[PDB]
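Budget justification note: compute hours in this period were largely spent on complex prediction jobs such as the one shown. Inputs:
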Amino acid sequence: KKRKKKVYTTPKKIKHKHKKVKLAVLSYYKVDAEGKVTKLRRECSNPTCGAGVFLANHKDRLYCGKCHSVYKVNA
Amino acid sequence: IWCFGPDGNGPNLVIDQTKAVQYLHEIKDSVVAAFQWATKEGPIFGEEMRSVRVNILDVTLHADAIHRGGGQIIPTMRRATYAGFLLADPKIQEPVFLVEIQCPEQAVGGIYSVLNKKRGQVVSEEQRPGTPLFTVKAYLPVNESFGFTGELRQATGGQAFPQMVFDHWSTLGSDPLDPTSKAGEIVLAARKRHGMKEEVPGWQEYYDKL
RNA sequence: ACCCACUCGGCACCUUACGAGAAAUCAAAGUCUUUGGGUUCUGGGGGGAGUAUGGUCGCAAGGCUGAAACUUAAAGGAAUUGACGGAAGGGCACCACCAGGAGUGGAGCCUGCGGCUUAAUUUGACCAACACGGGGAAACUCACCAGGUCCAGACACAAUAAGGAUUGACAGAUUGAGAGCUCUUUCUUGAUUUUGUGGGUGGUGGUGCAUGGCCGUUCUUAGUUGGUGGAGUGAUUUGUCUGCUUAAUUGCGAUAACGAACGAGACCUUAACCUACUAAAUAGUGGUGCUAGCAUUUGCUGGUUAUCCACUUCUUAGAGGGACUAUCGGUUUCAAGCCGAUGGAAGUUUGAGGCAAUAACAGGUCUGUGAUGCCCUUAGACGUUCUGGGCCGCACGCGCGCUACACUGACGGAGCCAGCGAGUCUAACCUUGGCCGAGAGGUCUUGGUAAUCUUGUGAAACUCCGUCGUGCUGGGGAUAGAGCAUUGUAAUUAUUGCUCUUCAACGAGGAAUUCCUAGUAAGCGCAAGUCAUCAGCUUGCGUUGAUUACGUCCCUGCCCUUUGUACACAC
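Corresponding output:
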């Protein structure tokens, strides 16, 4: 038995590098002149999600990020 | 990859497509023994091959290595390489020069004209920016700029001054099978300088049938 | 003439070697390292080469004389061991034959190897491969191919990095795919991780000609060795054998051998004997014993330790006993044994195995192993995985098997007797009985972790009765068509089984060749390994059960003695 090279009919596949956000945490909370802060992304209604899980925005729904549920803005 | 005959360095490769053959192990010693022979001297007129590739699609062998040994390996592949290299229309490649002819303004007019005299040509019509001393690189099939040291002096005046240098090869296919083609006849001079058959053997005698 | 006894000379010969020799050998080849009787010739490693040339002699053929260049580290002698002989003798073996049996080869089919073919049709093996790798492969297996995935990058170092190294991500697209693989819009986690450098790690990757181990073969033959002693300078040899005998280097006996050892044997296991010991509801038997039925002069059955008792002959299994060739006759040289008869369960090593000597083979196996060196690779992975395909493809040859080619048969009905197994609760195994169902199967339950339930495995040949009636026929089931079921997610390149439709070659087989001498081959079936399903395979078990011969070395091999050898890689 003599082996052979594995043919590549397609170019190489590149593993995705994570989108390293730079201080995007500063863009999830908004403070007023008195410093009163308010969340900008909604929270997950499932108990095991977190008080700052900050459901990711999308085109026509709301994806959690951790609990991997689906939310609708107008429900 | 096995070897690079001649010398184990020449641009000749032992490519195997043999993917279901067992006895490649004990023949790689003597397959490479005669692969460098057919590339040291050639079939047509007997010199070094260059950019010649051997693509062993398949090999048929014996059970034991006795009549599959050196006595029956060197000759049999000395007719197998002579087959493929002749089945792909063997051609001629000729060395050229790295000339840089120091010259006046219009000596190029002499140079550019005397360069294309014997199938030679020009790479580029470059020049020195700082002076009207132009410098030209050219293709010359080593045949042959015997110093034209008079010809460029017959056009320009009092500064003509040719000096040249040497470079790598260059290839053009002229179909050397018949004694009519231009490179199919230069081999004739080298042929009788060797003292063997005038006619080039075709691939029919070096290649068999089913 | 002969006989006897001498003596000289000659051809020789027999023993021993005191002696010699390298030894074979020698009475001269002795009186030679204790070297000198007289004398002539020749040789100085092998080839080149008795050659070139010169010379001489010859009618010539050629003779006599006779180099060198170059080339080589051996050529050669004599014996030893082995190997081999189309050398001789002698033993052994149904892996050889005689007398026979059954076949295989011929038809079909299963299956293996080659070959052709493909993407792969993975592969190793060539008496001692070829129903072998437990290899009856859908996925896996699996080692190949077209693909998609994970890092299973230990450890150390450097770099990146909480102003975040990073991983995951629902939806679309891509995508075989409900892989966030990666893209499309941006959330989760948090020094777990990412890049490189060294080090690994993994690999059914290669190397069995690097190996261990294992296994097979030589070799199922009877062979192997050392101690002391004898011969030789020695390697070696005798012992270990002329003969007879044995399956046997088994013994008797002959002996420069003696006493030994391993193998064989001895050993053990299985099978048959034991009315004797020991027993028993997981084994059976007897009881006009318990109860009941049957038919009625009384025999056959059902629940009988749980409805009792008595026992171990059948069954089981412990301990043993039994044959050791026992007795009688013959044979041989008394003998080792052998042959026949009697008695005996057993008289073939009682049967059959297991283990089985030194030495090896480049026998095979790294593809059994987290046995294993080296080498190859290690992130676009040859590692690991998931989908699908392949291992089975098909002008062809060979091997091993199954089915058959028929009347000592087939078909149908009926009678109807085993053993060796195995089986699930560390779970879907073995399933009884009843039901559905032509079948295939499905079904509710029962029993079994097992001498108890499958199971008296009620198996098949066989037996009886009937149909067929010489028609390749009702033999044969090949290929193919349609449907029904189970296992598996998945049956397509038919899993398999079942139903029906088709009855192809095949009228018994050429060379050749296989195996086999008594519970034997062969006919017949069952169990088990395989296994989710698949048994034409195979191990075992049994059922029926021959012929022929108790031998020979002609054929084939093996071994021994002698012999020959220029071989030792050993024809």
